[PDB]
Design a protein around this ligand. Structure first.
Ligand SMILES: Nc1ncnc2c1ncn2[C@@H]1O[C@H](CO)[C@@H](O)[C@H]1O
Ligand SMILES: Nc1ncnc2c1ncn2[C@@H]1O[C@H](CO)[C@@H](O)[C@H]1O
Ligand SMILES: Nc1ncnc2c1ncn2[C@@H]1O[C@H](CO)[C@@H](O)[C@H]1O
Ligand SMILES: Nc1ncnc2c1ncn2[C@@H]1O[C@H](CO)[C@@H](O)[C@H]1O
Ligand SMILES: [K+]
Ligand SMILES: [K+]
Lengths: 331, 330
């Protein structure tokens, strides 16, 4: 039975730069609200010059998910490329300190470590502005084949389709994972990311390279270019073995063939910062999944972790998810 | 018209913040509630044992300048960072708050100072500081026109650790007083006071410092006494104005024989005490440079301090001017 890892995740290694803003700031700066907005180095400088005093926290969607799995008690690993700089050192420290295996080697100091300027509005929504930096170097050379072979699930970001060579690494992961009887999972990441790579994402699912897909409502609607959510659910269920579809305050639904399992969102005192919600939903789900739990219980664990992360600043819970899961009887 | 209300001078530091259990401090021989100086090797070692962290611009005087600006006052800062990413963060955050900050980095080594701050379940903070580029702060960093044009110049007792910062401070005191401005200092930390007791007393008695900030522990340390009433009597005799904080018991402001007691504000929970004294000084000095009564200066200080301890991060993320308006202090 013994496997070295429950979950390997693969993504853009990013440090977040976080500030609260008013609604007008997003309009003035033509930032798309609630989305991941890619930016070049010049725009990164410009936006930073306009940003208020900030807090820094290690981020990266898949990075956050790996950290969450480790926090819950699972065995996690991560592939993602930073630079040999202070931001890279922060990223390396934080993920390793959480007890995630992280061994991707920087290639030099330039391009520098990716950062995302995340603007949080009063409603708690987050709008991200990401300079990919050293993420553009992630490639097949960064696949630790022994780790993929020894991970129950390898999970990756749709966001990896933006940098040039990351997709080649992911295809290598899929080959190795499936040769060793493991499963592959992806998140659709962002509705505009889906707009960019819709055909390629559908191909990953239909060809069986991806077994388990994570989406939110917006991403699922985007995937099929529909405004009919019921259509989106029917189609996603036909395109992948298992789909986990989140619906913000309305909880989540897990699909497997004709099976549907609806889960409620937890009670929130107040939505502080939604950054990381989907990532931590994936942590909870994948932790449950690799512990042999029912699909419903995987959904419950996802909703618990996501509800915790949106009540704090920072994309990675600072409290014990295992303790919260125990208190909730999810164990 | 004067360009600045408050110029502060201190060690420019980025904070690296994590919550820990009580045993961690014991295992690592970290003095609880204190500023613990560390070398580069110890910084690497402690970081290797620290959990996932959050980074936020810090530096005691940096936080104070940011708080004055937040309240609506006009603030400037002198402090030295390196030409590196942490220095860029520090530079951005203080300038983004509307603080004049023009100190030029001198190189990439030593790198920008950082302090690993461990917050225990009681909200207490224990700081472990590698001074880095702070050791390079000297007289060359004094913007004489800024000192000349600031109502109050305020500095950290912490500046007595790096080698040449005290020379910059003596130059500031000269310029400030030549232009009829006032000088202020904070005693910073009780162990810092133990290190520089005689020098601090000399700054006060010689008139180089006009307004002194202390907490209870610092005041007791200054006179090596267990008697808080003795410490208050003595500190009042040694400086023109003393502002002495007493944590949950508020503060007392002393001027000659005058004493003004002020209450702590009501709080939801002590999340992280980092910055409490810094922000008390922000509120006090903001009030002081707006011509407010010493009691109202104390009340502004207690408001700002009470806000900062209810959040993670040494610099309030909320509007202090709005809070002051709501509390009817402005
Ligand atoms: N292009 C990107 N790829 C992967 N993660 C990203 C991207 N932009 C922002 N993020 C991360 O998304 C997280 C929230 O899901 C943040 O912690 C942030 O670092
Ligand atoms: N407003 C909200 N209230 C409760 N949970 C939420 C909210 N927004 C997001 N979530 C949680 O985050 C997940 C992904 O958005 C959801 O499935 C849900 O569990
Ligand atoms: N040696 C030091 N000099 C000045 N400020 C410091 C020192 N060590 C820690 N600090 C700062 O003290 C602040 C809290 O008062 C923290 O934000 C931290 O950066
Ligand atoms: N427990 C507390 N409750 C309210 N205010 C506090 C507390 N601890 C410290 N402070 C504030 O911070 C200042 C410096 O410690 C005090 O004068 C006080 O105003
Ligand atoms: K969050
Ligand atoms: K604080």
């Amino acid at each position: 039975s013994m496997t070295r890892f429950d979950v390997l995740t693969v993504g853009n290694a990013i440090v977040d730069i976080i500030s609260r803003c008013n609604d007008q700031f997003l309009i003035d700066n033509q930032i798309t609200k609630a989305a991941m907005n890619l930016i070049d180095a010049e725009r990164a400088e410009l936006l930073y010059s306009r940003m208020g005093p900030a807090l820094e926290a290690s981020g990266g969607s898949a990075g956050n998910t790996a950290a969450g799995v480790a926090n819950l008690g699972g065995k996690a690993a991560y592939f993602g490329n930073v630079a040999a700089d202070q931001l890279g050192d922060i990223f390396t420290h934080d993920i390793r300190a959480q007890g995630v295996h992280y061994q991707t080697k920087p290639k030099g100091a330039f391009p520098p470590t990716a950062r995302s300027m995340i603007f949080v509005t009063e409603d708690g929504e987050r709008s991200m502005n990401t300079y990919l930096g050293a993420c553009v170097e992630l490639g097949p050379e960064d696949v630790e084949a022994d780790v993929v072979a020894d991970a129950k699930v390898t999970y990756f970001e749709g966001y990896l389709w933006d940098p040039p060579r990351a997709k080649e690494a992911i295809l290598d992961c899929a080959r190795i994972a499936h040769q060793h009887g493991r499963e592959m999972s992806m998140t659709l990441s962002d509705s505009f990311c889906v707009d960019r790579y819709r055909g390629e994402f559908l191909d990953l699912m239909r060809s069986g390279k991806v077994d388990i897909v994570f989406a939110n409502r917006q991403e699922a609607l985007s995937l099929y270019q529909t405004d009919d959510f019921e259509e989106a659910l029917n189609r996603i269920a036909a395109d992948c073995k298992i789909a986990a579809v989140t619906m913000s305050e309305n909880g989540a639904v897990i699909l497997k063939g004709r099976e549907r399992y609806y889960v409620n969102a937890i009670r929130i005192r107040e939505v502080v910062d939604t950054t990381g919600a989907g990532d931590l939903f994936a942590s909870g789900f994948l932790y449950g999944y690799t512990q042999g739990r029912s699909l419903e219980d995987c959904g419950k664990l996802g909703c618990l972790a996501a509800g915790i992360v949106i009540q704090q600043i920072g994309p990675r819970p600072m409290t014990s998810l295992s303790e919260a899961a125990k208190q909730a009887g999810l164990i």
